């Protein structure tokens, strides 16, 4: 199975070079081009360039010729892209991607690295459990929550019960205020499910290398 | 550069209908009998996913509700019948001429029956209180249409500062929207008041939906 592994995030100060990695597996790395694509969140896609790892033959989009630098490491099967003197216009998701062998269509895509260009510091999230009002009426269903606050940069990933709880879940996109993000998620289950069975939100923040589990407990009186 | 213009920018379609997305190229993308045009589906948080290659070939694992046609400078992506899971942004992309280039995209939104929000209010977690801050959360879930207002009232009065709102993308299952509203105060501000209330105002009712709690009341 073809695999293109990219870190979730990279944060640099304006002006400091960023170097992105894309670790390949499941196929012969040195046999195929690696392409790079830029996408600002909310916007469309731009092809940056490509490199063939066998001979490091390279084609770059004229727009990126003085901005991007493509290299490979044959020994670790990794493609790198370096961006010089980054500005806020360089903040984007960057994908590595591959054509289907013998084809001309992009069949394989890495998950993307969100490059953030900011003077703000890496900050791990605070994760707060949201259990219903103390002493409230119990319906046929119950809604729980998880509030993710005070982190930087994006992204965080949130699951419930390690992803085994998927139905009735809403995960809200992060919003930035005065240099820190907040994200939240809600889950709705039957009243027979909770608190009898345990429900935990799991929060991953790859930029700070943090994973937090928060089990949702009923509120105590007073 | 070969420039690809997509039309429309956004399309709203009822379930079971036909969706048609158009893509024009500034010059031909045909070469030696082949049309070098791809179509992709992209959901939030995910890379683009290949649907159609060489104008009309279904990629493995892609349902036959998706089809592609055209040649030269005119291409069409057809979805028929549309399904809930199809909410997304779609892109054409030419693979004939250096550099590869993409269309600007088309957002597919789904039209469905009006639904009223289910509202839930959450007092600050006690853990947050130890940090010296206090957020009250209100979830307004599974409503349609997307339009909605939230009002926060503290001791019966709408009061300024500390709000963060976020809306989901259309749900891939029931085709609804959800919203989260978080009111953050300092711990001292929070503890100077007792009643906390969010009111949701939506097309589906002339009456706002009110959820409230009192601080230190169980």
């Amino acid at each position: 199975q073809v695999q293109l592994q990219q870190p979730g995030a990279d944060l640099v100060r304006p002006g400091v070079s960023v170097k992105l990695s894309c670790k390949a597996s499941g196929y012969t790395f040195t046999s195929y081009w690696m392409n790079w694509v830029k996408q600002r969140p909310g916007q469309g896609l731009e092809w940056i360039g490509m490199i063939h790892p066998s001979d490091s033959e390279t084609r770059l989009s004229q727009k990126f010729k003085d901005k991007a630098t493509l290299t490979v490491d044959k020994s670790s099967s990794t493609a790198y892209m370096q961006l010089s003197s980054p500005t806020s216009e360089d903040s984007a998701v960057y994908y590595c991607a591959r054509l289907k062998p013998g084809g001309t269509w992009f069949a394989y895509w890495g998950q993307g690295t969100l490059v953030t260009v900011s003077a703000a510091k890496t900050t791990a999230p605070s994760v707060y459990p949201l259990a219903p009002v103390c002493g409230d009426t119990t319906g046929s269903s119950v809604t729980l929550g998880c509030l993710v606050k005070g982190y930087f940069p994006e992204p965080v990933t949130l699951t419930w019960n390690s992803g085994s709880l998927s139905s009735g879940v809403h995960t809200f996109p992060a919003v930035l205020q005065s240099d820190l993000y907040t994200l939240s998620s809600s889950v709705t289950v039957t009243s027979s499910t909770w608190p009898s069975q345990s429900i935990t939100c799991n929060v991953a923040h790859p930029a700070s290398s943090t994973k937090v589990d928060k089990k949702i407990e009923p509120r105590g009186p007073t | 550069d070969i420039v690809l213009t997509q039309s429309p920018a956004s399309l709203t379609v009822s379930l079971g209908q036909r969706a048609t997305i158009s893509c024009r190229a500034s010059k031909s993308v045909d070469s030696y009998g082949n049309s070098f045009m791809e179509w992709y589906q992209q959901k939030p948080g995910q890379p683009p996913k290949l649907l159609i290659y060489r104008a009309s070939n279904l990629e493995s694992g892609i349902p036959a509700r998706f089809s592609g046609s055209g040649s030269r400078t005119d291409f069409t992506l057809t979805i028929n019948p549309v399904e809930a899971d199809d909410v997304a942004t779609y892109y054409c992309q030419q693979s004939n001429e250096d550099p590869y280039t993409f269309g600007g995209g088309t957002k597919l939104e789904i039209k469905r029956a009006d639904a009223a929000p289910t509202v839930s209010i959450f007092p600050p977690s006690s853990e947050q209180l130890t940090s010296g801050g206090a957020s009250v959360v209100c979830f307004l879930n599974n409503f349609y249409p997307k339009d909605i207002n939230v009002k926060w009232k503290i001791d019966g009065s709408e009061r300024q500062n500390g709000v963060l709102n976020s809306w989901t993308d259309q749900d891939s299952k029931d085709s609804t929207y959800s919203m989260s509203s978080t009111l953050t105060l300092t711990k001292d501000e929070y503890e100077r008041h007792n009643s906390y209330t969010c009111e949701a105002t939506h097309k589906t009712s002339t009456s706002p939906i009110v959820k409230s709690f009192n601080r230190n009341e169980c």
Binding site: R59, Q62, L99, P101, G102, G103, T104 | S31, Y32, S95, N96, E97, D98, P99, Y100
Partner: peptide, 24 residues
Amino acid sequence: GPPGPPGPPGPPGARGLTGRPGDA
């Protein structure tokens, strides 16, 4: 009987992108 040798190299890939147009 023991397995035969590895097979032949695969076919060559698809033709390259067409070059950029000359400047105006």
